[PDB]
Curated annotation (Swiss-Prot), chain B:
Species, as recorded: Escherichia coli
Protein name, per record: Copper resistance protein C
Family, similarity comment: Belongs to the CopC family.
UniProt gene name: pcoC
Consequence of substituting residue 49 to F: Decreases affinity for copper(I)
UniProt keyword annotation of Metal-binding present: yes
UniProt entry tagged with the keyword Signal: yes
Domain notes: Contains two copper binding sites, separated by 30 angstroms, which can be occupied either one at a time or simultaneously. One is specific for Cu(I), while the other is specific for Cu(II).
Miscellaneous remark of the record: Significant differences in the properties of PcoC and P.syringae CopC were initially reported. The differences were attributed to the presence of an additional N-terminal alanine residue in the initially expressed PcoC protein.
Subunit structure of this chain's protein: Monomer-dimer equilibrium in solution for the apo protein. Dimerization is significantly enhanced upon binding of copper(I).
Residues at which Cu(2+) binds: 1, 92
Molecular function terms, GO-annotated: copper ion binding
Record key words, sorted: Copper, Metal-binding, Periplasm, Plasmid, Signal
Gene Ontology terms describing biological process: copper ion transport; response to copper ion
Amino acid sequence: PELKSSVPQADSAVAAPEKIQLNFSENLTVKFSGAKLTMTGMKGMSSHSPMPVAAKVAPGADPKSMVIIPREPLPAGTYRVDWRAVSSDTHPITGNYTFTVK
Amino acid sequence: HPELKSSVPQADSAVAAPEKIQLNFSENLTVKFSGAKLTMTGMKGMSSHSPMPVAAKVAPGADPKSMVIIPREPLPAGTYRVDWRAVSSDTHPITGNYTFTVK
């Protein structure tokens, strides 16, 4: 299980996304996978108070992907995506990346 | 920087469901920059590969060197992991984690 790509792309600066797409190299065992979203920075906020962002995860149209749908608006700021992917091998793989909302 | 001196439930202990989780540190906490999360990593009847986040709220302790985690849901018998973030006046985050079981 390896992350092939993501939308938003890592280290990118884009308009608030309607959803976050994570595309992996193998078919996901979604019941054992997951992801979380955190707002690590925002104008007017301290640099030491990261805010978790409520979100829901759903299986993608492509079985090698999953999508994160935020349950709250995404203010301009910096975000971190933490993910956990598991395939038929049943061996958890984790990773993370950051992107900015402008 | 703050160091975890003790906790209730204690690390690697088996206890009756706690009403709250108390984290005691060596230095006064800057609670606004601190925090913690609770995850149910195991439960009889559930898969071994599907950790479940447990909603909770964090409040400052009576003792300025402590903070309390109050779960927003019941805690069924099972295994739990506490992840914490503690910051003192030095303003440097220190993180750690420990596990305990509810029986």
